[PDB]
Amino acid sequence: VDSKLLPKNIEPPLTSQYSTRHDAPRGLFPFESYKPSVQLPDMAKLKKM
Amino acid sequence: VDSKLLPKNIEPPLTSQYSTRHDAPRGLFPFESYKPSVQLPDMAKLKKM
Amino acid sequence: ALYDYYALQLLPLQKAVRGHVLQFEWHQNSLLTNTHPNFLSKIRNINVQ
Amino acid sequence: LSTNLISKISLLRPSPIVTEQPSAEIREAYIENFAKGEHISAIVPGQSISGTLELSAQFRVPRYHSKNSFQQALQMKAQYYRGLPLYEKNTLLERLKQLTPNEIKELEHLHDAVFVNTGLQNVRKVRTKKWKKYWQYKAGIPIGLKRVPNPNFLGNCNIKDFKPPYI
């Protein structure tokens, strides 16, 4: 007998691949200042001198 | 089950997304940005090393 | 070396996330007794009651 | 702008299916009086799908014996249509010239066991095709895939995505 023709349970289908967000409390994450500089520093003046 | 809507946030400055400046103090974020010392004997030392 | 340059392109953004994640990891170390060690909580002397 | 550099610049940087009470005002009045503990005029069933699984008003155990083919045998001391393939005229006739009335009662129940299994297989397939459309209908999906939205809406959360400082 081919599979998926075998008798299966009548249940609510799977919710495994669902995306959840989280309620995090007030003091969990720190306050962040100083945006980091992604850009590399340039040393044209040092090698020019 | 009984979800409510947060109405509206009148945001003061520095309490906002993208409210970060390069001029801010890095209390944490331990990586530093260092002052280039341009002294002419130290220039010769940097050229040699 | 094209992918060395790819590794030499996105390195300080990696250090920026390595700083903010470390900053939040430091935020996890908040206990309020590591900080001010005198937090006077509550006392009461001997009453007539 | 030179073509030795244009190939490398982008290289270095790549940039009728349910059986509930369909009136949406008798179901509410049923619960408004049910909390008090009162019956109502109209009837209300639980939700389900339609369709009846009706056996024994369908394929029966066949009658391969006659009206007296067992007691007279007691005296003389004796490709598929539904589930069985149609046999040829000459090949099956000598096969039924071999068997005994001790095995006719076996054969009747074997063929009934084939018939009931096929008549359950196809209804089971139709029932799965109905339940797969029930569960989609009861979950907001339409089929086969002034309003105000609640916070449990797809895309209307209250937890806004906070951005990192480097972005």
Q: Is A32 on the interface with C (CB under 8 A)?
A: yes
This structure was determined by cryo-EM
Q: CA nearest B17: which of D16, D96, A32, D149?
A: A32
Using CA atoms of B20, B24, B26, B29 in order, give the dihedral in degrees to the nearest 10.
20
DSSP state of C7: H
Amino acid at A30: P
Question: For B31, which of C19, C26, C27 is closest by C-beta distance?
Answer: C19
Residues D127, D52: Cα–Cα separation, whole Å = 10
Residue D161 to chain B, least CA–CA distance (Å): 10
Residues D109, D64: Cα–Cα separation, whole Å = 10
**What is the SS3 string spanning chain A?**
CCCCCCCCCCCCCCCCCCCCCCCCCCCCCCCCCCCCCCCCCCCHHHHHC
Buried b (16+ CB within 10 A) or exposed e, D121-136: eebeeebeeebebbeb
Give this entry's resolution in angstroms: 6.9
Whether residues B30 and C22 touch (CB distance < 8 A) is answered with yes
Q: Give the nearest chain B residue to D149 (CA atoms).
A: B5
Structure tokens, D150: 């609640």
Residues D8, D10: Cα–Cα separation, whole Å = 6
Q: How far is CA A40 from CA B10, C12, D10, D14, D105, in A?
A: 36, 7, 19, 17, 91
Among residues 13-32 of chain D, which lie with CB inside 8 Å of chain C?
13
